Amino acid sequence: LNGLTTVKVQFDEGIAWVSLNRPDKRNAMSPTLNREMLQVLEALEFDDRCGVVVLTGEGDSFSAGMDLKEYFRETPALIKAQIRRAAGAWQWRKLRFYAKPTIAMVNGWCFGGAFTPLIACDLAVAADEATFGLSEINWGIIPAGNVTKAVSQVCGERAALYYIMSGEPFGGQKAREIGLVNESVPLAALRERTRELAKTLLGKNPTVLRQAKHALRRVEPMDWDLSEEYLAAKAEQTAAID
Amino acid sequence: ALNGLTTVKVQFDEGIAWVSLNRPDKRNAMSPTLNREMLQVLEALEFDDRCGVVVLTGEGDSFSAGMDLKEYFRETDNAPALIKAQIRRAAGAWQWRKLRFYAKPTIAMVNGWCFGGAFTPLIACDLAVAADEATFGLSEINWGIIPAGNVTKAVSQVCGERAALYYIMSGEPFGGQKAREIGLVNESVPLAALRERTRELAKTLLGKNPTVLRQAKHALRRVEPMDWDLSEEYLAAKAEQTAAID
Amino acid sequence: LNGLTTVKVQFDEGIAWVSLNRPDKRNAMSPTLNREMLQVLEALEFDDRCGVVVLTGEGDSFSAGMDLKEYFREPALIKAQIRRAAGAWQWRKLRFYAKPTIAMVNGWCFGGAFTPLIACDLAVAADEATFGLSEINWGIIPAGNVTKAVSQVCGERAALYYIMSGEPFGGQKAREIGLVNESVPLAALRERTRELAKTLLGKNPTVLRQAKHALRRVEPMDWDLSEEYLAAKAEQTAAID
Amino acid sequence: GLTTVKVQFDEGIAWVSLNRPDKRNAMSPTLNREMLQVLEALEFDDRCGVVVLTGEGDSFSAGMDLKEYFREPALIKAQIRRAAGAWQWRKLRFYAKPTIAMVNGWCFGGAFTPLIACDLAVAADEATFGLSEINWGIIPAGNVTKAVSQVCGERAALYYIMSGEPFGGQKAREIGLVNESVPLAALRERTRELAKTLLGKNPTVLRQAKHALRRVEPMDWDLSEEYLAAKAEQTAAID
Amino acid sequence: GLTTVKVQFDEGIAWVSLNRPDKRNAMSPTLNREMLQVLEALEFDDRCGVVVLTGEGDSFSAGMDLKEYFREAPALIKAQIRRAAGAWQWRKLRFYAKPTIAMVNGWCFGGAFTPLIACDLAVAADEATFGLSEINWGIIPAGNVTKAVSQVCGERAALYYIMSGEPFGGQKAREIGLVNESVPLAALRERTRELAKTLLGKNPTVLRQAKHALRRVEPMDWDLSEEYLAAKAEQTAAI
Amino acid sequence: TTVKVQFDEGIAWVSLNRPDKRNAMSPTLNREMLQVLEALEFDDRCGVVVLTGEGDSFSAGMDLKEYFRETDAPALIKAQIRRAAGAWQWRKLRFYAKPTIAMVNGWCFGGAFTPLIACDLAVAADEATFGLSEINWGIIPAGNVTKAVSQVCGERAALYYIMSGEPFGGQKAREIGLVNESVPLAALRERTRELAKTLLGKNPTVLRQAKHALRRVEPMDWDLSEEYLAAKAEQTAAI
Ligand SMILES: CC(C)(COP(=O)(O)OP(=O)(O)OC[C@H]1O[C@@H](n2cnc3c(N)ncnc32)[C@H](O)[C@@H]1OP(=O)(O)O)[C@@H](O)C(=O)NCCC(=O)NCCS
Ligand SMILES: CC(C)(COP(=O)(O)OP(=O)(O)OC[C@H]1O[C@@H](n2cnc3c(N)ncnc32)[C@H](O)[C@@H]1OP(=O)(O)O)[C@@H](O)C(=O)NCCC(=O)NCCS
Ligand SMILES: CC(C)(COP(=O)(O)OP(=O)(O)OC[C@H]1O[C@@H](n2cnc3c(N)ncnc32)[C@H](O)[C@@H]1OP(=O)(O)O)[C@@H](O)C(=O)NCCC(=O)NCCS
Ligand SMILES: CC(C)(COP(=O)(O)OP(=O)(O)OC[C@H]1O[C@@H](n2cnc3c(N)ncnc32)[C@H](O)[C@@H]1OP(=O)(O)O)[C@@H](O)C(=O)NCCC(=O)NCCS
Ligand SMILES: CC(C)(COP(=O)(O)OP(=O)(O)OC[C@H]1O[C@@H](n2cnc3c(N)ncnc32)[C@H](O)[C@@H]1OP(=O)(O)O)[C@@H](O)C(=O)NCCC(=O)NCCS
Ligand SMILES: CC(C)(COP(=O)(O)OP(=O)(O)OC[C@H]1O[C@@H](n2cnc3c(N)ncnc32)[C@H](O)[C@@H]1OP(=O)(O)O)[C@@H](O)C(=O)NCCC(=O)NCCS
């Protein structure tokens, strides 16, 4: 957490408000931001100053997507693949099964690549004024990285295809309708609502909370006979490590 | 199989088998005894000509308060491992193994409290009509346990990842209208109209061809993990099997 | 495209209005229509006069499902070939069509019509449209690929309710359960559908085709595999553009 | 109380023998019900820590009963079909104790499912295997088609399903149907030595390990690592 | 009227011969279209109840035509050409209405692995030379060759020959489960004809249902496969 | 320090360097081996990596003292140490940017199976001893060992050696598909070098794309694999 340039961490009574911090660039996710975000999230897993992580963006943006210059334009094949993997290293590899509960607080512009860490977070609270967009089609690219998969994970096929194919923007209430976020409230109540939800998660047994939210995503592709076998081993693991 | 029941009641009604958990003093908590009796009841009703549809509900003010904290959890905590496994299997033996592909159509009538383990038989049933006043809750997190058995899988089967994680992680209660919005139940109506609405839907299912109704509702849950090429092959055999056994 | 007997095709500023043309039979899908529809869909994938295809029904019916007279009632391998020819255009060709597809449900949509409706990329229904999985009322299961198609876009509760009950529902209910993207009054159906088609026509056609395919491809994949596939898909997109 | 099954206890080994030699150990609804009772009773019988499945006489099992199971209502037929698979693979494939199939002779049709659902299998060289269902005008129903595909390659599975051609114990070993094939005179002792080897292991760890192998097969590597981490913790918490 | 494929009928056996010996039976877009028409014509031709796929001359097939298929286009046209190959190589062949046997009489390289593996069975000559030689030409085993080899061979053997491009004979192909049997070339035709006659003696409806069910149940869990096999058995008895 | 790296005309001989501990994989070695693999995938002096062990061992498995006993630690720390093992043993190795060959020169037990199987190819010495000895130590084959064995071995062979913990040599490892080839130890180094030189003669881009494509298409249906392989082939030509 020392010498961060693109990421801000503010601790608040057990809550780690992690803000993408490139407001002048609308929090576009560059290779520098990708490296810092993984370093922050890895450190916060063992930082006792927090038991829940809130992911948001500084200024009027959640995130305008990947940096069109520093991530896309300025990027050898193996060198290119390493930078692409560094994005997914924190956007979904670390976030999807994160050690502590995660809440995405969408305060504003959320486009393209921003959908992957938003969906990899366990919960999401958006502002009514927040503007979501799968604008990749308008920039001549598909929703790569894991954006296409992430949208398919939480939204129905009809809604996923409509916003990928058309690139049409939509607000927080529409994001809640299609299952992209858990709740949409006015921006003036966004932080208060997200903080109340984080405080509710802080009141739970942290081990049981971690085991339960992981098991939900693990059992998704399993058959019912396999899920019962996994959940039984997961329940015994929970009581053994608490 | 229907005689000497201590925790479950069965009442026949014009081709409907109203199966209600019968431990109201315990809010219909599901004990190992109840898990054993319900499997007996559901197995017998699959061949009982007095029914063409099964309605699963609870006596009193509770649909179910989840697994018995005393008889299912506490009294089996220090039991031998294979004994605990057998008790756990017996719960899922009727909660999802029997219910999810029951030979007859099943409707879950959520008349009241529905917590924790009660979500698995509720979701394993084909259709679900809840009361607006009913209170749902994945309160396992507040008791220090994960939603085990098959509760976690059952919730992810009908509810989106956001709604599934929200109520699993927060343990927050919600009513029948929220259960309908998140896809947990088909319909939500006031409690005063819950039985008449459930009975009307049950009579609608009774008016259908029972063989085709059984075959079609099973095929829906079978084809979900299949690719479209495999599902077309399975639906072709399922359609031929339907015509041969009708 | 020449000599068609059950399908009509009208070109409109890059839009291929493909209508099932059996209105006196409520656009029931016969083995003849199944053969012609695949014949038309294969030709339109390379027809430079179209960049988007709108599937709709002539008259008051989008489609009344499979032809109860020419398809169902009328050898095992012969029966299998006729059944396969239905899915050949209803999902095999439509689900990963080389061009964007929009289903315009102008009226009756029952049984087997669900498969090409769901295999299309997008769907705009009329509020007055009447959907229904009435196969249970006819004594059959939603065969072909209907059960899978309904499973693909609707939640398990909604899918089971309409399959088991055979209850009909309107355009707004179809939009609510995720069967279609939007639902407008019939008087505004063609204008809204043409507006959506022009929006798709303004996109990069190669990127649009690759993106709509990638969405349906990554669904059964794990996140590690989908990231690998999307990286290869993104590279294929830039190379063939 | 059993009429179709014989159980012999030997130093922690429960020798479970199919006992219908007059019908070549064909599996009837009576045998299917009796076998589930035996397996359910043996999983808590402390007198055994390993179960060996074999057949009395010159047969392992000639498949399902052509008369009782097949020739003799829709949901009644489905119940009898489910009773066969209830013990043939639902109970056996994840049985609480290690299981060994000892193929002493004829092994045809439906016999493949309990043979494959068992953890391990030792065959006699003189034993004759055969997916002869095609010769009787039926497909390998129940779960035989799935069971054969689980242990043998697609080529070997298709060859013996489509041709109905018999093969011996050495061929069964080569295609992976059984772990080992020895002469019949050495079959029981080789099986008993393997059963004794399994009895020397930690029973909890052995049950957990053998279950974990079959569970992780359809998992991706990221998910299997998560499953194996919980399975190992579950192992240490109950041992 | 066919130019690249030859069809000879023999007592219910349709000997289908790839016929481009001057190009070592390389598969061109012309051959790909002709093979699909032959397969679509033979599935209802009562002169055959079994299909034997092989190659004329000293070749089975040297893979895809390096000139006509790869070297000699717009994106959708190249995809249509690519789709036409898989249309007969695996889409039609993998679930073909009639039993299929691949007779590997000679060279079998690259893209030839897909129709070889999509056929139900395969008998090779010991002298036949196999090879996933795409790596030697600077391309991955595209089409469905990578999946086909993954379907019948273990991961070690699949990776070894994909990565090394090293050739191997008929006995090695039998060892790794690529073919069911390998015999001397002088005995290949009679050994293949005997297997074809063995398939012709089966109930053709039951044979088609069983060979399809084997490949359908591969990715199913055991509970789902039992559900599918019960429906497949009822469909078999009805048709 | 715990790893040795020797460059040889494009070959990166990567040796586990804890011979006094039989190359037991400590948390120290786990972190160091990941850095070596990360450094080599961008080191232009190598186009192939051979993973072997110093001394008489390939690897005796995980360090019983430093990896297991000394982590007896809070749950998240234990999970972090466990994840660091799989970070290089399969997360980095299974889809490594360059071809990998495991040279099993000696003892290969327990956790050593995971990096052995995550390597693309493997050549063993006949004299080398292989063992899934976890059952003898009271633990299940955790990490990804159970999944790795199931990935390359049949269910029977996987279950036999997990349940019995029985040791086996290089020829048996080749017979069950654990390694590609087994030769006498005196010929092991040159046989592995021939394979490494063969891999070095291939287009490294096409070789990486092809070897990755094989493992990616395993769980796909044939229609999905064809779509993936077409994009993979286009990605190959563009890169
Ligand atoms: C997010 C957005 C609506 C904000 O609107 P705005 O308040 O008017 O701010 P601006 O459009 O003027 O851009 C703000 C700055 O941040 C940069 N910026 C915005 N989004 C960026 C992105 N993905 N990548 C890199 N830079 C970005 C701009 O280049 C600009 O830089 P500059 O001030 O040095 O010239 C608008 O910037 C936008 O549409 N960005 C692209 C969103 C997107 O489509 N992402 C997916 C790309 S595939
Ligand atoms: C369902 C509930 C809201 C009803 O509240 P109520 O009407 O006021 O009734 P009570 O709380 O007084 O409980 C009545 C009886 O039923 C028992 N009971 C209720 N739920 C029970 C359960 N899962 N298991 C065992 N007993 C239960 C009570 O212990 C009590 O028994 P007692 O009278 O002998 O003391 C309440 O019982 C409850 O909060 N929780 C259990 C629900 C739950 O969270 N289950 C999952 C736990 S993992
Ligand atoms: C679609 C429907 C609501 C239209 O009702 P309508 O305007 O009153 O039209 P009609 O019912 O009078 O029938 C119109 C004609 O189209 C035919 N038709 C309608 N649906 C048909 C279908 N699936 N298959 C074959 N013919 C059909 C009728 O047989 C009739 O032919 P005819 O006039 O030459 O005798 C009506 O046909 C219906 O109730 N059901 C359609 C069938 C259906 O549900 N199919 C899925 C079944 S598996
Ligand atoms: C196993 C077999 C090779 C033994 O040959 P054998 O020593 O000559 O024994 P036989 O066939 O002469 O007779 C054995 C008795 O057991 C019965 N039997 C053998 N297999 C049987 C089976 N699946 N089901 C019912 N009865 C069977 C015979 O009907 C016969 O009864 P009977 O003596 O009262 O007339 C031979 O019996 C056989 O082929 N059985 C069928 C194997 C098979 O195909 N199973 C799959 C069926 S789909
Ligand atoms: C099959 C093979 C071993 C036989 O070699 P041979 O008997 O000595 O005879 P040739 O090598 O001269 O080949 C004979 C003709 O068929 C052609 N031929 C062989 N394989 C061909 C292929 N895939 N595509 C197109 N033409 C091919 C040759 O170009 C040659 O053409 P020509 O006679 O007009 O000059 C050799 O031709 C060969 O290696 N072919 C390539 C196999 C392969 O790698 N396929 C995968 C390609 S990615
Ligand atoms: C590999 C093996 C057969 C070699 O036998 P050996 O040549 O006679 O060598 P030794 O047993 O005498 O031990 C050599 C050293 O290496 C260590 N060693 C060997 N395997 C080790 C392992 N997994 N972990 C930690 N140390 C190990 C010994 O503790 C010993 O250290 P020390 O000399 O400081 O006391 C033997 O070490 C063995 O049987 N098992 C090691 C672990 C194993 O087999 N499986 C993993 C258990 S889960």
The protein residue with its alpha carbon nearest to ligand 2, atom 11, reads B27
Give the sheet arrangement for strand A183-185, strand by strand. Answer: A7-12, A14-20, A50-57, A102-106, A123-127, A183-185
Distance CA D55, CA A7 (A): 70
Q: Cβ contact (<8 Å) for D120 and F160? A: yes
C-beta of B69 in contact with ligand 2 (< 6 A): yes
Distances in Å between the alpha carbon of F6 and those of C154, F2, F13, F140, F196?
Answer: 58, 14, 5, 35, 14
F156: how many CB neighbours lie within 10 A of its CB?
24
Distance CA E216, CA E212 (A): 6
Distances in Å between the alpha carbon of E235 and those of B233, B237, D138, E230?
Answer: 11, 5, 11, 9
Judge whether F133 is annotated as a binding position: yes
Distance CA D141, CA E227 (A): 10
Contact predicate A148/C218, CB 8 Å = yes
Which E positions 94-123 lie with beta carbon below 8 A of chain B? Answer: 95
Beta strand E181-183 with D5-10 is unpaired
DSSP letter at B73? I
Distance CA D92, CA D144 (A): 14
Distance CA D153, CA D227 (A): 26
**B131 Cβ neighbours under 8 A, 6+ residues apart:** B110, B111, B112, B176, B188, B189, B190, B191, B194
- What SS3 state is found at A26? coil
C-beta of C143 in contact with ligand 3 (< 6 A): no
Q: CA angle, A172 as apex, C230 and C190 as ends, to 5°?
A: 75
The protein residue with its alpha carbon nearest to ligand 1, atom 41, reads A64
Distance CA D138, CA D131 (A): 11
Compute the distance from residue F101 Cα to the ligand 6 centre, in Å.
Answer: 24
Closest approach atom of ligand 6 to CA F21: 16
Of the candidates D215, D223, D234, which has its C-beta nearest A237's C-beta? D234
Chain D contact for B226 (CB, 8 A cutoff): no
- Give the mutation candidate from B45, B82, B211 for the D interface (greatest D CB count, under 10 A): B82
Distances in Å between the alpha carbon of E54 and those of A180, E42, E107, E188?
Answer: 54, 15, 11, 11
Closest approach atom of ligand 5 to CA E59: 1
Binding residues of D for CoA: 23-24, 62, 64-66, 132, 136
Q: Which chains touch B (3 or more CB pairs under 8 A)?
A: A, C, D, E, F
Give CA F189 to chain center in angstroms: 17
Contacts of D210 in chain A (CB under 8 A): none
**B138 Cβ neighbours under 8 A, 6+ residues apart:** B115, B116, B119, B147, B151, B155, B167, B168, B171
The protein residue with its alpha carbon nearest to ligand 6, atom 48, reads F134
Query: What domains sit in chain D, N to C, each tagged with a CATH number?
Result: 1-201 (3.90.226.10), 202-239 (6.10.250.2850)
Q: Cβ contact (<8 Å) for E210 and D133? A: yes
Of the candidates B101, B234, B243, which has its C-beta nearest E228's C-beta? B234
Longest distance between any two alpha carbons in chain A, whole Å:
51
Distance CA A21, CA A28 (A): 9
Compute the distance from residue D134 Cα to the ligand 4 centre, in Å.
Answer: 15
Contact predicate B149/B35, CB 8 Å = no
* Phi–psi pair at C28, nearest 5 degrees: -65, 140
Residue that the structure tokens 């291929």 belong to: C16
**D231 Cβ neighbours under 8 A, 6+ residues apart:** A233, D208, D211, D212, D215, F140, F142
Q: Cβ contact (<8 Å) for D43 and B82? A: yes
Distance CA D34, CA A229 (A): 26
**C137 Cβ neighbours under 8 A, 6+ residues apart:** B208, C166
Contact predicate D99/D50, CB 8 Å = yes
Contacts of A226 in chain D (CB under 8 A): 215, 218
Of the candidates D75, D96, D204, which has its C-beta nearest B47's C-beta? D75
Contact predicate B23/B7, CB 8 Å = yes
* Identity of residue F32: E
Task: Produce one character per residue of A187-201: b if its CB has 16 or more CB atoms within 10 Å, e if not.
Answer: beebbebbbebbeeb
- What SS3 state is found at A121? coil
Distance CA C113, CA C130 (A): 12
Distance CA A232, CA E105 (A): 54
Task: Produce one character per residue of B168-198: b if its CB has 16 or more CB atoms within 10 Å, e if not.
Answer: bbbbbebebbbbbebbbbbbbbebeebbebb
From A26, A31, A178, A192, select the one nearest A109 (Cα to Cα). A26
Compute the distance from residue C186 Cα to the ligand 2 centre, in Å.
Answer: 53
Distance CA C55, CA C8 (A): 10
Radius of gyration of chain A (CA): 18
From C105, C99, C98, C148, select the one nearest C123 (Cα to Cα). C105
And the tokens for D104? 């002493």
Distance CA E115, CA E95 (A): 12
Q: CA angle, A157 as apex, A152 and A159 as ends, to 5°?
A: 95
Give the sheet arrangement for strand D5-10, strand by strand. Answer: D5-10, D12-18, D48-55, D99-103, D120-124, D180-182
For residue E16, the surrounding DSSP H or E stretch is strand E12-18
Q: CA angle, C48 as apex, C45 and C54 as ends, to 5°?
A: 55
- What SS3 state is found at E58? coil
DSSP structure string for chain C: --S-SSEEEEEETEEEEEEE--GGGTT-B-HHHHHHHHHHHHHHTT-TTEEEEEEEESTTEEE-SB-IIIIII--HHHHHHHHHHHHIIIIITTTT-SS-EEEEE-SEEEGGGHHHHHHSSEEEEETT-EEE-TTGGGT---TTTHHHHHHHHS-HHHHHHHHHH---B-HHHHHHTTSSSEEE-GGGHHHHHHHHHHHHHTS-HHHHHHHHHHHHHSTTS-HHHHHHHHHHHHHHHHHH-
Which residues line the pocket of ligand 5, CB cutoff 6 A? Answer: E 23-24, 26, 62-67, 107, 109-110, 133-134, 137, 139
Distance CA E47, CA E44 (A): 9
Distance CA D163, CA D168 (A): 15
Distance CA D64, CA D70 (A): 8
| D1 burial level (CB within 10 Å; 0-12, 13-18, 19+) | exposed
State the virtual CA torsion across B146, B150, B155, B157 in degrees, nearest 10.
140
* Identity of residue D196: K
Contacts of E221 in chain A (CB under 8 A): 223, 225-226
From F226, B49, F50, select the one nearest E148 (Cα to Cα). F226
- Give the mutation candidate from D45, D75, D211, D233 for the B interface (greatest B CB count, under 10 A): D75
Radius of gyration of chain C (CA): 18
The protein residue with its alpha carbon nearest to ligand 4, atom 15, reads D23
Q: Cβ contact (<8 Å) for F150 and D176? A: no
Beta strands in B8-77 (DSSP E): 8-13, 15-21, 51-58, 62-64
Compute the distance from residue A76 Cα to the ligand 1 centre, in Å.
Answer: 27
Distance CA A39, CA D171 (A): 56
Contact predicate A171/A181, CB 8 Å = no
Distance CA F181, CA F50 (A): 15
Chain F contact for A238 (CB, 8 A cutoff): no
* Phi–psi pair at B131, nearest 5 degrees: -85, 145
Chain D contact for C188 (CB, 8 A cutoff): no
- What SS3 state is found at D103? strand
Contact predicate E233/E225, CB 8 Å = no
H-only helix segments in D43-107: 74-85
Distance CA F169, CA F187 (A): 16
Contact predicate A230/B151, CB 8 Å = no
Q: CA angle, A58 as apex, A56 and A61 as ends, to 5°?
A: 80
Q: Which chains touch D (3 or more CB pairs under 8 A)?
A: A, B, C, E, F
Nearest CA in chain F to C216: F224
**E201 Cβ neighbours under 8 A, 6+ residues apart:** none
Sign of CA dihedral B38, B41, B47, B51: negative
* Identity of residue F87: A
Distance CA E232, CA B136 (A): 41
Contact predicate F110/F133, CB 8 Å = yes
* Phi–psi pair at C62, nearest 5 degrees: -70, -55
Q: Cβ contact (<8 Å) for B237 and E235? A: yes
And the tokens for F139? 């633990």
Nearest CA in chain E to D151: E218
Sign of CA dihedral E110, E116, E117, E123: negative
And the tokens for B214? 């059984």
- Please provide the distance, in angstroms rounded to a whole number, between the alpha carbons at the two ends of chain C: 28
Residue that the structure tokens 């303004």 belong to: C202
Chain F contact for E71 (CB, 8 A cutoff): no
Residue-level length of chain F:
239
Pocket test for ligand 2, best of B21, B27, B73 (most atoms within 8 A of CB): B27
Please write down the HEC assignment for all residues of D129-168.
EECHHHHHCCCCCCCHHHHHHHHCCHHHHHHHHHHCCCEC
Distance CA D78, CA B215 (A): 13
Distance CA A131, CA A154 (A): 18
Give the sheet arrangement for strand C108-110, strand by strand. Answer: C61-63, C108-110, C130-132
Q: Cβ contact (<8 Å) for E135 and F206? A: yes
Distance CA C54, CA C50 (A): 10
Compute the distance from residue C134 Cα to the ligand 3 centre, in Å.
Answer: 12
Compute the distance from residue D147 Cα to the ligand 2 centre, in Å.
Answer: 45
| E73 burial level (CB within 10 Å; 0-12, 13-18, 19+) | exposed
Contact predicate F119/D185, CB 8 Å = no
B5: left (phi over 0), alpha (psi -120 to 50) or beta: beta
| E126 burial level (CB within 10 Å; 0-12, 13-18, 19+) | middle
Distance CA F217, CA E145 (A): 11
Contact predicate F200/E111, CB 8 Å = no
Please write down the HEC assignment for all residues of F185-223.
HHHHHHHHHHHHHHHHCCCHHHHHHHHHHHHHCCCCCHH
Q: Measure C78 CA to nearest chain E CA, in Å.
A: 9
Paired residues of D137 in beta bridges = none
Distance CA C186, CA C189 (A): 5
- What SS3 state is found at F146? helix
Structural determination approach: X-ray
Compute the distance from residue F178 Cα to the ligand 6 centre, in Å.
Answer: 22
